[PDB]
């Protein structure tokens, strides 16, 4: 329960960067809790979103981008590696061509870059989860 939610951290990403998030759903999957991770272009919440990743636990995952204030083509996946009431480790890798999302060590989603990752200035993690760890690789 350390780390407040909504959690916001200034960040800079480039090919090779990795964002690791460790947390746990706050309620039963039956009640459809959500998890949202947004890579923003500015420090403010209303800024554009380079990568929007939203998990409706137990049902589906939606990905998109908000450019110049407007949402683009939504991408949806029914792949659901998350386990009810379980702590999860989510890792997002910045590859040259896209983001690769691993859930507990398994590749589960990818999203081709719509905007250069270098445009990212902030990452916000929120919705129905407790956050135990947040780390951006800066090597």
GROMACS .gro file of N, CA, C and O in nm:
model
  556
    1UNK      N    1   0.084  -0.123   0.000
    1UNK     CA    2   0.000   0.000   0.000
    1UNK      C    3   0.086   0.126   0.000
    1UNK      O    4   0.035   0.238   0.010
    2UNK      N    5   0.218   0.107  -0.009
    2UNK     CA    6   0.309   0.220  -0.015
    2UNK      C    7   0.280   0.279  -0.153
    2UNK      O    8   0.209   0.216  -0.231
    3UNK      N    9   0.331   0.397  -0.184
    3UNK     CA   10   0.305   0.457  -0.315
    3UNK      C   11   0.157   0.489  -0.332
    3UNK      O   12   0.072   0.401  -0.339
    4UNK      N   13   0.124   0.618  -0.340
    4UNK     CA   14  -0.015   0.658  -0.356
    4UNK      C   15  -0.070   0.633  -0.496
    4UNK      O   16   0.005   0.630  -0.593
    5UNK      N   17  -0.202   0.616  -0.505
    5UNK     CA   18  -0.270   0.595  -0.633
    5UNK      C   19  -0.387   0.694  -0.632
    5UNK      O   20  -0.460   0.702  -0.534
    6UNK      N   21  -0.405   0.772  -0.740
    6UNK     CA   22  -0.325   0.776  -0.863
    6UNK      C   23  -0.179   0.806  -0.839
    6UNK      O   24  -0.144   0.895  -0.761
    7UNK      N   25  -0.093   0.732  -0.907
    7UNK     CA   26   0.051   0.751  -0.895
    7UNK      C   27   0.104   0.818  -1.023
    7UNK      O   28   0.077   0.772  -1.135
    8UNK      N   29   0.178   0.927  -1.006
    8UNK     CA   30   0.235   1.000  -1.118
    8UNK      C   31   0.384   1.016  -1.098
    8UNK      O   32   0.428   1.051  -0.989
    9UNK      N   33   0.463   0.989  -1.202
    9UNK     CA   34   0.607   1.003  -1.194
    9UNK      C   35   0.660   1.059  -1.325
    9UNK      O   36   0.624   1.012  -1.433
   10UNK      N   37   0.745   1.161  -1.316
   10UNK     CA   38   0.804   1.217  -1.437
   10UNK      C   39   0.895   1.108  -1.491
   10UNK      O   40   0.958   1.035  -1.414
   11UNK      N   41   0.901   1.095  -1.623
   11UNK     CA   42   0.983   0.992  -1.683
   11UNK      C   43   1.022   1.028  -1.825
   11UNK      O   44   0.963   1.114  -1.888
   12UNK      N   45   1.125   0.960  -1.874
   12UNK     CA   46   1.170   0.980  -2.010
   12UNK      C   47   1.200   0.840  -2.059
   12UNK      O   48   1.264   0.761  -1.990
   13UNK      N   49   1.148   0.807  -2.177
   13UNK     CA   50   1.167   0.676  -2.234
   13UNK      C   51   1.235   0.680  -2.370
   13UNK      O   52   1.223   0.777  -2.443
   14UNK      N   53   1.304   0.572  -2.402
   14UNK     CA   54   1.371   0.558  -2.530
   14UNK      C   55   1.379   0.408  -2.554
   14UNK      O   56   1.351   0.329  -2.464
   15UNK      N   57   1.416   0.368  -2.675
   15UNK     CA   58   1.426   0.226  -2.705
   15UNK      C   59   1.515   0.158  -2.601
   15UNK      O   60   1.625   0.206  -2.571
   16UNK      N   61   1.466   0.047  -2.546
   16UNK     CA   62   1.542  -0.024  -2.445
   16UNK      C   63   1.491   0.001  -2.305
   16UNK      O   64   1.521  -0.076  -2.213
   17UNK      N   65   1.415   0.109  -2.286
   17UNK     CA   66   1.361   0.144  -2.155
   17UNK      C   67   1.258   0.041  -2.109
   17UNK      O   68   1.188  -0.018  -2.190
   18UNK      N   69   1.249   0.020  -1.979
   18UNK     CA   70   1.152  -0.074  -1.925
   18UNK      C   71   1.082  -0.009  -1.806
   18UNK      O   72   1.145   0.053  -1.721
   19UNK      N   73   0.949  -0.022  -1.802
   19UNK     CA   74   0.871   0.032  -1.692
   19UNK      C   75   0.814  -0.091  -1.622
   19UNK      O   76   0.749  -0.175  -1.685
   20UNK      N   77   0.843  -0.105  -1.493
   20UNK     CA   78   0.795  -0.219  -1.416
   20UNK      C   79   0.697  -0.172  -1.308
   20UNK      O   80   0.727  -0.081  -1.232
   21UNK      N   81   0.582  -0.237  -1.303
   21UNK     CA   82   0.480  -0.202  -1.206
   21UNK      C   83   0.438  -0.327  -1.131
   21UNK      O   84   0.412  -0.431  -1.192
   22UNK      N   85   0.435  -0.318  -0.999
   22UNK     CA   86   0.394  -0.430  -0.916
   22UNK      C   87   0.277  -0.380  -0.832
   22UNK      O   88   0.287  -0.276  -0.767
   23UNK      N   89   0.167  -0.453  -0.835
   23UNK     CA   90   0.051  -0.412  -0.758
   23UNK      C   91  -0.051  -0.523  -0.740
   23UNK      O   92  -0.026  -0.639  -0.772
   24UNK      N   93  -0.168  -0.486  -0.689
   24UNK     CA   94  -0.272  -0.584  -0.665
   24UNK      C   95  -0.411  -0.522  -0.678
   24UNK      O   96  -0.433  -0.409  -0.635
   25UNK      N   97  -0.505  -0.595  -0.739
   25UNK     CA   98  -0.641  -0.543  -0.755
   25UNK      C   99  -0.698  -0.519  -0.616
   25UNK      O  100  -0.667  -0.595  -0.523
   26UNK      N  101  -0.779  -0.416  -0.600
   26UNK     CA  102  -0.836  -0.386  -0.469
   26UNK      C  103  -0.961  -0.467  -0.436
   26UNK      O  104  -0.994  -0.485  -0.319
   27UNK      N  105  -1.030  -0.515  -0.539
   27UNK     CA  106  -1.151  -0.592  -0.516
   27UNK      C  107  -1.163  -0.711  -0.609
   27UNK      O  108  -1.088  -0.726  -0.706
   28UNK      N  109  -1.259  -0.795  -0.576
   28UNK     CA  110  -1.293  -0.916  -0.650
   28UNK      C  111  -1.309  -0.891  -0.800
   28UNK      O  112  -1.370  -0.793  -0.840
   29UNK      N  113  -1.257  -0.981  -0.883
   29UNK     CA  114  -1.269  -0.966  -1.028
   29UNK      C  115  -1.416  -0.966  -1.071
   29UNK      O  116  -1.452  -0.908  -1.174
   30UNK      N  117  -1.501  -1.032  -0.992
   30UNK     CA  118  -1.645  -1.037  -1.020
   30UNK      C  119  -1.700  -0.896  -1.032
   30UNK      O  120  -1.794  -0.870  -1.108
   31UNK      N  121  -1.642  -0.805  -0.955
   31UNK     CA  122  -1.685  -0.666  -0.952
   31UNK      C  123  -1.616  -0.577  -1.055
   31UNK      O  124  -1.633  -0.456  -1.055
   32UNK      N  125  -1.539  -0.641  -1.143
   32UNK     CA  126  -1.468  -0.573  -1.252
   32UNK      C  127  -1.382  -0.452  -1.214
   32UNK      O  128  -1.407  -0.340  -1.260
   33UNK      N  129  -1.279  -0.473  -1.131
   33UNK     CA  130  -1.196  -0.358  -1.097
   33UNK      C  131  -1.113  -0.326  -1.222
   33UNK      O  132  -1.100  -0.410  -1.312
   34UNK      N  133  -1.057  -0.206  -1.228
   34UNK     CA  134  -0.977  -0.165  -1.342
   34UNK      C  135  -0.834  -0.130  -1.301
   34UNK      O  136  -0.805  -0.106  -1.184
   35UNK      N  137  -0.747  -0.127  -1.401
   35UNK     CA  138  -0.607  -0.088  -1.383
   35UNK      C  139  -0.578  -0.001  -1.504
   35UNK      O  140  -0.608  -0.041  -1.616
   36UNK      N  141  -0.525   0.118  -1.483
   36UNK     CA  142  -0.493   0.202  -1.599
   36UNK      C  143  -0.351   0.259  -1.588
   36UNK      O  144  -0.310   0.304  -1.482
   37UNK      N  145  -0.277   0.254  -1.699
   37UNK     CA  146  -0.141   0.308  -1.709
   37UNK      C  147  -0.140   0.398  -1.833
   37UNK      O  148  -0.170   0.353  -1.944
   38UNK      N  149  -0.110   0.526  -1.813
   38UNK     CA  150  -0.105   0.623  -1.923
   38UNK      C  151   0.031   0.690  -1.934
   38UNK      O  152   0.084   0.741  -1.835
   39UNK      N  153   0.088   0.690  -2.054
   39UNK     CA  154   0.216   0.756  -2.079
   39UNK      C  155   0.177   0.892  -2.139
   39UNK      O  156   0.126   0.899  -2.250
   40UNK      N  157   0.200   1.000  -2.065
   40UNK     CA  158   0.163   1.134  -2.109
   40UNK      C  159   0.277   1.214  -2.172
   40UNK      O  160   0.394   1.189  -2.145
   41UNK      N  161   0.241   1.313  -2.254
   41UNK     CA  162   0.339   1.399  -2.320
   41UNK      C  163   0.377   1.518  -2.232
   41UNK      O  164   0.477   1.584  -2.257
   42UNK      N  165   0.297   1.547  -2.130
   42UNK     CA  166   0.325   1.658  -2.039
   42UNK      C  167   0.300   1.612  -1.896
   42UNK      O  168   0.245   1.506  -1.872
   43UNK      N  169   0.342   1.694  -1.800
   43UNK     CA  170   0.324   1.660  -1.660
   43UNK      C  171   0.179   1.664  -1.615
   43UNK      O  172   0.145   1.609  -1.511
   44UNK      N  173   0.092   1.728  -1.693
   44UNK     CA  174  -0.048   1.737  -1.655
   44UNK      C  175  -0.134   1.621  -1.705
   44UNK      O  176  -0.111   1.569  -1.814
   45UNK      N  177  -0.234   1.585  -1.625
   45UNK     CA  178  -0.327   1.476  -1.656
   45UNK      C  179  -0.407   1.495  -1.785
   45UNK      O  180  -0.445   1.397  -1.849
   46UNK      N  181  -0.436   1.619  -1.821
   46UNK     CA  182  -0.513   1.646  -1.942
   46UNK      C  183  -0.429   1.641  -2.071
   46UNK      O  184  -0.484   1.652  -2.182
   47UNK      N  185  -0.298   1.625  -2.058
   47UNK     CA  186  -0.212   1.620  -2.176
   47UNK      C  187  -0.236   1.496  -2.260
   47UNK      O  188  -0.303   1.401  -2.217
   48UNK      N  189  -0.180   1.496  -2.380
   48UNK     CA  190  -0.195   1.384  -2.471
   48UNK      C  191  -0.136   1.258  -2.413
   48UNK      O  192  -0.046   1.262  -2.329
   49UNK      N  193  -0.188   1.145  -2.459
   49UNK     CA  194  -0.144   1.014  -2.413
   49UNK      C  195  -0.085   0.935  -2.529
   49UNK      O  196  -0.154   0.902  -2.626
   50UNK      N  197   0.044   0.906  -2.518
   50UNK     CA  198   0.119   0.832  -2.620
   50UNK      C  199   0.076   0.685  -2.619
   50UNK      O  200   0.063   0.621  -2.724
   51UNK      N  201   0.054   0.632  -2.499
   51UNK     CA  202   0.015   0.494  -2.481
   51UNK      C  203  -0.082   0.487  -2.362
   51UNK      O  204  -0.046   0.522  -2.250
   52UNK      N  205  -0.204   0.444  -2.391
   52UNK     CA  206  -0.309   0.427  -2.291
   52UNK      C  207  -0.331   0.275  -2.282
   52UNK      O  208  -0.355   0.208  -2.383
   53UNK      N  209  -0.319   0.221  -2.161
   53UNK     CA  210  -0.334   0.077  -2.137
   53UNK      C  211  -0.435   0.060  -2.025
   53UNK      O  212  -0.407   0.096  -1.911
   54UNK      N  213  -0.552   0.007  -2.057
   54UNK     CA  214  -0.654  -0.008  -1.955
   54UNK      C  215  -0.704  -0.150  -1.941
   54UNK      O  216  -0.755  -0.209  -2.036
   55UNK      N  217  -0.689  -0.204  -1.822
   55UNK     CA  218  -0.731  -0.340  -1.794
   55UNK      C  219  -0.861  -0.346  -1.714
   55UNK      O  220  -0.874  -0.281  -1.610
   56UNK      N  221  -0.958  -0.420  -1.766
   56UNK     CA  222  -1.080  -0.442  -1.692
   56UNK      C  223  -1.056  -0.586  -1.649
   56UNK      O  224  -1.071  -0.679  -1.728
   57UNK      N  225  -1.013  -0.604  -1.524
   57UNK     CA  226  -0.980  -0.736  -1.472
   57UNK      C  227  -1.087  -0.840  -1.493
   57UNK      O  228  -1.203  -0.821  -1.455
   58UNK      N  229  -1.048  -0.950  -1.555
   58UNK     CA  230  -1.140  -1.058  -1.582
   58UNK      C  231  -1.213  -1.047  -1.714
   58UNK      O  232  -1.268  -1.147  -1.760
   59UNK      N  233  -1.215  -0.929  -1.776
   59UNK     CA  234  -1.288  -0.914  -1.900
   59UNK      C  235  -1.205  -0.884  -2.023
   59UNK      O  236  -1.201  -0.963  -2.118
   60UNK      N  237  -1.138  -0.769  -2.024
   60UNK     CA  238  -1.059  -0.732  -2.140
   60UNK      C  239  -0.962  -0.618  -2.115
   60UNK      O  240  -0.964  -0.554  -2.011
   61UNK      N  241  -0.880  -0.593  -2.216
   61UNK     CA  242  -0.781  -0.488  -2.212
   61UNK      C  243  -0.803  -0.399  -2.333
   61UNK      O  244  -0.829  -0.447  -2.444
   62UNK      N  245  -0.796  -0.268  -2.312
   62UNK     CA  246  -0.813  -0.174  -2.422
   62UNK      C  247  -0.688  -0.087  -2.430
   62UNK      O  248  -0.632  -0.047  -2.328
   63UNK      N  249  -0.641  -0.060  -2.552
   63UNK     CA  250  -0.523   0.025  -2.571
   63UNK      C  251  -0.556   0.133  -2.673
   63UNK      O  252  -0.637   0.111  -2.764
   64UNK      N  253  -0.496   0.250  -2.657
   64UNK     CA  254  -0.523   0.361  -2.747
   64UNK      C  255  -0.420   0.472  -2.726
   64UNK      O  256  -0.321   0.454  -2.655
   65UNK      N  257  -0.445   0.585  -2.790
   65UNK     CA  258  -0.361   0.703  -2.776
   65UNK      C  259  -0.458   0.820  -2.783
   65UNK      O  260  -0.565   0.809  -2.844
   66UNK      N  261  -0.425   0.930  -2.718
   66UNK     CA  262  -0.510   1.049  -2.725
   66UNK      C  263  -0.416   1.154  -2.782
   66UNK      O  264  -0.319   1.194  -2.719
   67UNK      N  265  -0.444   1.195  -2.904
   67UNK     CA  266  -0.358   1.291  -2.971
   67UNK      C  267  -0.432   1.418  -3.001
   67UNK      O  268  -0.538   1.417  -3.064
   68UNK      N  269  -0.376   1.529  -2.955
   68UNK     CA  270  -0.437   1.658  -2.971
   68UNK      C  271  -0.577   1.656  -2.913
   68UNK      O  272  -0.673   1.705  -2.972
   69UNK      N  273  -0.586   1.594  -2.796
   69UNK     CA  274  -0.711   1.586  -2.723
   69UNK      C  275  -0.812   1.485  -2.771
   69UNK      O  276  -0.917   1.472  -2.710
   70UNK      N  277  -0.783   1.412  -2.878
   70UNK     CA  278  -0.881   1.315  -2.927
   70UNK      C  279  -0.831   1.172  -2.924
   70UNK      O  280  -0.717   1.144  -2.961
   71UNK      N  281  -0.918   1.081  -2.881
   71UNK     CA  282  -0.883   0.940  -2.876
   71UNK      C  283  -0.875   0.885  -3.017
   71UNK      O  284  -0.954   0.923  -3.103
   72UNK      N  285  -0.780   0.796  -3.040
   72UNK     CA  286  -0.762   0.739  -3.172
   72UNK      C  287  -0.830   0.603  -3.183
   72UNK      O  288  -0.927   0.575  -3.114
   73UNK      N  289  -0.776   0.520  -3.271
   73UNK     CA  290  -0.831   0.387  -3.294
   73UNK      C  291  -0.803   0.295  -3.177
   73UNK      O  292  -0.689   0.260  -3.149
   74UNK      N  293  -0.910   0.256  -3.110
   74UNK     CA  294  -0.900   0.168  -2.996
   74UNK      C  295  -0.860   0.027  -3.038
   74UNK      O  296  -0.905  -0.023  -3.140
   75UNK      N  297  -0.774  -0.035  -2.959
   75UNK     CA  298  -0.731  -0.172  -2.984
   75UNK      C  299  -0.778  -0.250  -2.863
   75UNK      O  300  -0.756  -0.208  -2.749
   76UNK      N  301  -0.843  -0.363  -2.886
   76UNK     CA  302  -0.892  -0.442  -2.774
   76UNK      C  303  -0.842  -0.585  -2.774
   76UNK      O  304  -0.831  -0.648  -2.879
   77UNK      N  305  -0.811  -0.636  -2.656
   77UNK     CA  306  -0.764  -0.772  -2.642
   77UNK      C  307  -0.843  -0.843  -2.533
   77UNK      O  308  -0.882  -0.781  -2.434
   78UNK      N  309  -0.868  -0.972  -2.552
   78UNK     CA  310  -0.941  -1.049  -2.453
   78UNK      C  311  -0.841  -1.134  -2.376
   78UNK      O  312  -0.879  -1.208  -2.285
   79UNK      N  313  -0.713  -1.125  -2.413
   79UNK     CA  314  -0.608  -1.200  -2.344
   79UNK      C  315  -0.611  -1.152  -2.198
   79UNK      O  316  -0.599  -1.032  -2.172
   80UNK      N  317  -0.626  -1.244  -2.105
   80UNK     CA  318  -0.636  -1.206  -1.964
   80UNK      C  319  -0.549  -1.290  -1.871
   80UNK      O  320  -0.597  -1.379  -1.801
   81UNK      N  321  -0.418  -1.261  -1.868
   81UNK     CA  322  -0.326  -1.335  -1.781
   81UNK      C  323  -0.338  -1.306  -1.632
   81UNK      O  324  -0.287  -1.382  -1.551
   82UNK      N  325  -0.404  -1.196  -1.595
   82UNK     CA  326  -0.417  -1.159  -1.454
   82UNK      C  327  -0.500  -1.258  -1.375
   82UNK      O  328  -0.599  -1.312  -1.425
   83UNK      N  329  -0.460  -1.283  -1.251
   83UNK     CA  330  -0.531  -1.378  -1.165
   83UNK      C  331  -0.602  -1.308  -1.050
   83UNK      O  332  -0.546  -1.222  -0.982
   84UNK      N  333  -0.726  -1.348  -1.028
   84UNK     CA  334  -0.809  -1.292  -0.922
   84UNK      C  335  -0.742  -1.287  -0.785
   84UNK      O  336  -0.687  -1.386  -0.737
   85UNK      N  337  -0.747  -1.169  -0.722
   85UNK     CA  338  -0.689  -1.150  -0.591
   85UNK      C  339  -0.539  -1.171  -0.579
   85UNK      O  340  -0.485  -1.176  -0.469
   86UNK      N  341  -0.472  -1.181  -0.693
   86UNK     CA  342  -0.327  -1.203  -0.695
   86UNK      C  343  -0.246  -1.077  -0.719
   86UNK      O  344  -0.291  -0.985  -0.787
   87UNK      N  345  -0.126  -1.072  -0.662
   87UNK     CA  346  -0.040  -0.958  -0.686
   87UNK      C  347   0.012  -0.978  -0.828
   87UNK      O  348   0.030  -1.092  -0.873
   88UNK      N  349   0.035  -0.870  -0.902
   88UNK     CA  350   0.084  -0.885  -1.038
   88UNK      C  351   0.209  -0.802  -1.065
   88UNK      O  352   0.232  -0.699  -1.000
   89UNK      N  353   0.291  -0.848  -1.159
   89UNK     CA  354   0.410  -0.775  -1.199
   89UNK      C  355   0.388  -0.741  -1.346
   89UNK      O  356   0.382  -0.830  -1.431
   90UNK      N  357   0.374  -0.613  -1.376
   90UNK     CA  358   0.351  -0.570  -1.513
   90UNK      C  359   0.476  -0.499  -1.564
   90UNK      O  360   0.527  -0.408  -1.498
   91UNK      N  361   0.528  -0.541  -1.678
   91UNK     CA  362   0.648  -0.477  -1.732
   91UNK      C  363   0.626  -0.435  -1.877
   91UNK      O  364   0.583  -0.514  -1.961
   92UNK      N  365   0.656  -0.308  -1.906
   92UNK     CA  366   0.638  -0.253  -2.040
   92UNK      C  367   0.773  -0.216  -2.100
   92UNK      O  368   0.841  -0.127  -2.050
   93UNK      N  369   0.811  -0.287  -2.206
   93UNK     CA  370   0.938  -0.266  -2.276
   93UNK      C  371   0.922  -0.181  -2.401
   93UNK      O  372   0.833  -0.203  -2.481
   94UNK      N  373   1.010  -0.084  -2.417
   94UNK     CA  374   1.006   0.002  -2.533
   94UNK      C  375   1.098  -0.058  -2.639
   94UNK      O  376   1.221  -0.053  -2.628
   95UNK      N  377   1.038  -0.119  -2.741
   95UNK     CA  378   1.112  -0.179  -2.850
   95UNK      C  379   1.114  -0.073  -2.959
   95UNK      O  380   1.041   0.025  -2.953
   96UNK      N  381   1.198  -0.093  -3.062
   96UNK     CA  382   1.205   0.005  -3.171
   96UNK      C  383   1.073   0.027  -3.241
   96UNK      O  384   1.039   0.140  -3.275
   97UNK      N  385   0.998  -0.080  -3.261
   97UNK     CA  386   0.872  -0.074  -3.332
   97UNK      C  387   0.747  -0.066  -3.245
   97UNK      O  388   0.641  -0.028  -3.293
   98UNK      N  389   0.758  -0.103  -3.119
   98UNK     CA  390   0.639  -0.100  -3.036
   98UNK      C  391   0.668  -0.125  -2.890
   98UNK      O  392   0.782  -0.142  -2.850
   99UNK      N  393   0.562  -0.125  -2.810
   99UNK     CA  394   0.573  -0.153  -2.668
   99UNK      C  395   0.536  -0.300  -2.655
   99UNK      O  396   0.445  -0.347  -2.723
  100UNK      N  397   0.609  -0.372  -2.571
  100UNK     CA  398   0.576  -0.510  -2.545
  100UNK      C  399   0.540  -0.516  -2.397
  100UNK      O  400   0.617  -0.473  -2.312
  101UNK      N  401   0.422  -0.569  -2.367
  101UNK     CA  402   0.374  -0.579  -2.230
  101UNK      C  403   0.375  -0.721  -2.177
  101UNK      O  404   0.308  -0.810  -2.231
  102UNK      N  405   0.450  -0.742  -2.070
  102UNK     CA  406   0.459  -0.873  -2.007
  102UNK      C  407   0.384  -0.872  -1.876
  102UNK      O  408   0.392  -0.776  -1.800
  103UNK      N  409   0.312  -0.980  -1.849
  103UNK     CA  410   0.239  -0.992  -1.724
  103UNK      C  411   0.296  -1.116  -1.656
  103UNK      O  412   0.284  -1.227  -1.708
  104UNK      N  413   0.360  -1.096  -1.542
  104UNK     CA  414   0.421  -1.206  -1.468
  104UNK      C  415   0.511  -1.290  -1.558
  104UNK      O  416   0.501  -1.412  -1.563
  105UNK      N  417   0.600  -1.222  -1.631
  105UNK     CA  418   0.694  -1.291  -1.718
  105UNK      C  419   0.646  -1.339  -1.853
  105UNK      O  420   0.727  -1.386  -1.932
  106UNK      N  421   0.517  -1.329  -1.882
  106UNK     CA  422   0.466  -1.375  -2.010
  106UNK      C  423   0.423  -1.262  -2.103
  106UNK      O  424   0.349  -1.173  -2.062
  107UNK      N  425   0.468  -1.267  -2.228
  107UNK     CA  426   0.431  -1.166  -2.326
  107UNK      C  427   0.281  -1.178  -2.347
  107UNK      O  428   0.231  -1.287  -2.379
  108UNK      N  429   0.208  -1.068  -2.329
  108UNK     CA  430   0.063  -1.072  -2.341
  108UNK      C  431   0.002  -0.969  -2.435
  108UNK      O  432  -0.108  -0.990  -2.486
  109UNK      N  433   0.071  -0.858  -2.455
  109UNK     CA  434   0.022  -0.753  -2.543
  109UNK      C  435   0.136  -0.674  -2.605
  109UNK      O  436   0.245  -0.666  -2.549
  110UNK      N  437   0.111  -0.616  -2.721
  110UNK     CA  438   0.208  -0.528  -2.786
  110UNK      C  439   0.124  -0.417  -2.848
  110UNK      O  440   0.005  -0.434  -2.872
  111UNK      N  441   0.187  -0.302  -2.872
  111UNK     CA  442   0.119  -0.187  -2.928
  111UNK      C  443   0.222  -0.111  -3.009
  111UNK      O  444   0.321  -0.062  -2.955
  112UNK      N  445   0.199  -0.103  -3.140
  112UNK     CA  446   0.291  -0.032  -3.228
  112UNK      C  447   0.293   0.116  -3.193
  112UNK      O  448   0.188   0.174  -3.164
  113UNK      N  449   0.411   0.176  -3.195
  113UNK     CA  450   0.425   0.317  -3.162
  113UNK      C  451   0.347   0.406  -3.257
  113UNK      O  452   0.355   0.391  -3.379
  114UNK      N  453   0.271   0.499  -3.201
  114UNK     CA  454   0.195   0.593  -3.282
  114UNK      C  455   0.266   0.728  -3.277
  114UNK      O  456   0.261   0.807  -3.372
  115UNK      N  457   0.332   0.753  -3.165
  115UNK     CA  458   0.408   0.874  -3.140
  115UNK      C  459   0.542   0.825  -3.085
  115UNK      O  460   0.547   0.723  -3.016
  116UNK      N  461   0.651   0.894  -3.115
  116UNK     CA  462   0.781   0.851  -3.065
  116UNK      C  463   0.779   0.844  -2.912
  116UNK      O  464   0.724   0.933  -2.846
  117UNK      N  465   0.838   0.739  -2.853
  117UNK     CA  466   0.839   0.726  -2.707
  117UNK      C  467   0.910   0.842  -2.639
  117UNK      O  468   0.888   0.869  -2.521
  118UNK      N  469   0.995   0.912  -2.714
  118UNK     CA  470   1.070   1.025  -2.662
  118UNK      C  471   0.979   1.142  -2.627
  118UNK      O  472   1.022   1.238  -2.563
  119UNK      N  473   0.854   1.135  -2.671
  119UNK     CA  474   0.758   1.241  -2.644
  119UNK      C  475   0.704   1.227  -2.502
  119UNK      O  476   0.648   1.322  -2.446
  120UNK      N  477   0.720   1.109  -2.444
  120UNK     CA  478   0.672   1.081  -2.308
  120UNK      C  479   0.746   1.160  -2.200
  120UNK      O  480   0.869   1.161  -2.195
  121UNK      N  481   0.672   1.227  -2.112
  121UNK     CA  482   0.732   1.304  -2.004
  121UNK      C  483   0.681   1.260  -1.868
  121UNK      O  484   0.741   1.290  -1.766
  122UNK      N  485   0.570   1.187  -1.867
  122UNK     CA  486   0.510   1.144  -1.741
  122UNK      C  487   0.434   1.012  -1.756
  122UNK      O  488   0.380   0.982  -1.862
  123UNK      N  489   0.433   0.933  -1.650
  123UNK     CA  490   0.359   0.807  -1.649
  123UNK      C  491   0.262   0.814  -1.531
  123UNK      O  492   0.301   0.853  -1.421
  124UNK      N  493   0.136   0.780  -1.554
  124UNK     CA  494   0.038   0.780  -1.446
  124UNK      C  495  -0.023   0.641  -1.435
  124UNK      O  496  -0.067   0.584  -1.536
  125UNK      N  497  -0.025   0.587  -1.313
  125UNK     CA  498  -0.082   0.455  -1.286
  125UNK      C  499  -0.198   0.475  -1.190
  125UNK      O  500  -0.181   0.532  -1.082
  126UNK      N  501  -0.317   0.431  -1.229
  126UNK     CA  502  -0.432   0.451  -1.143
  126UNK      C  503  -0.544   0.348  -1.159
  126UNK      O  504  -0.527   0.246  -1.225
  127UNK      N  505  -0.656   0.380  -1.095
  127UNK     CA  506  -0.777   0.298  -1.089
  127UNK      C  507  -0.772   0.206  -0.966
  127UNK      O  508  -0.703   0.237  -0.869
  128UNK      N  509  -0.842   0.093  -0.973
  128UNK     CA  510  -0.857   0.003  -0.858
  128UNK      C  511  -0.749  -0.094  -0.816
  128UNK      O  512  -0.772  -0.215  -0.805
  129UNK      N  513  -0.631  -0.040  -0.788
  129UNK     CA  514  -0.519  -0.124  -0.748
  129UNK      C  515  -0.440  -0.057  -0.637
  129UNK      O  516  -0.455   0.062  -0.610
  130UNK      N  517  -0.357  -0.137  -0.571
  130UNK     CA  518  -0.265  -0.089  -0.469
  130UNK      C  519  -0.133  -0.108  -0.544
  130UNK      O  520  -0.114  -0.207  -0.616
  131UNK      N  521  -0.043  -0.012  -0.529
  131UNK     CA  522   0.086  -0.013  -0.598
  131UNK      C  523   0.198  -0.038  -0.498
  131UNK      O  524   0.214   0.037  -0.403
  132UNK      N  525   0.274  -0.145  -0.519
  132UNK     CA  526   0.383  -0.175  -0.428
  132UNK      C  527   0.516  -0.130  -0.485
  132UNK      O  528   0.607  -0.100  -0.410
  133UNK      N  529   0.526  -0.125  -0.617
  133UNK     CA  530   0.651  -0.084  -0.681
  133UNK      C  531   0.633  -0.023  -0.819
  133UNK      O  532   0.547  -0.066  -0.897
  134UNK      N  533   0.714   0.078  -0.848
  134UNK     CA  534   0.714   0.145  -0.977
  134UNK      C  535   0.857   0.182  -1.012
  134UNK      O  536   0.924   0.256  -0.940
  135UNK      N  537   0.903   0.131  -1.125
  135UNK     CA  538   1.039   0.159  -1.166
  135UNK      C  539   1.056   0.175  -1.316
  135UNK      O  540   0.999   0.099  -1.394
  136UNK      N  541   1.132   0.276  -1.355
  136UNK     CA  542   1.162   0.302  -1.495
  136UNK      C  543   1.312   0.280  -1.511
  136UNK      O  544   1.392   0.339  -1.439
  137UNK      N  545   1.350   0.192  -1.602
  137UNK     CA  546   1.492   0.166  -1.624
  137UNK      C  547   1.553   0.288  -1.693
  137UNK      O  548   1.502   0.335  -1.795
  138UNK      N  549   1.662   0.338  -1.635
  138UNK     CA  550   1.732   0.455  -1.689
  138UNK      C  551   1.878   0.423  -1.720
  138UNK      O  552   1.967   0.505  -1.696
  139UNK      N  553   1.901   0.303  -1.773
  139UNK     CA  554   2.036   0.259  -1.807
  139UNK      C  555   2.071   0.289  -1.953
  139UNK      O  556   1.981   0.278  -2.039
   0.00000   0.00000   0.00000
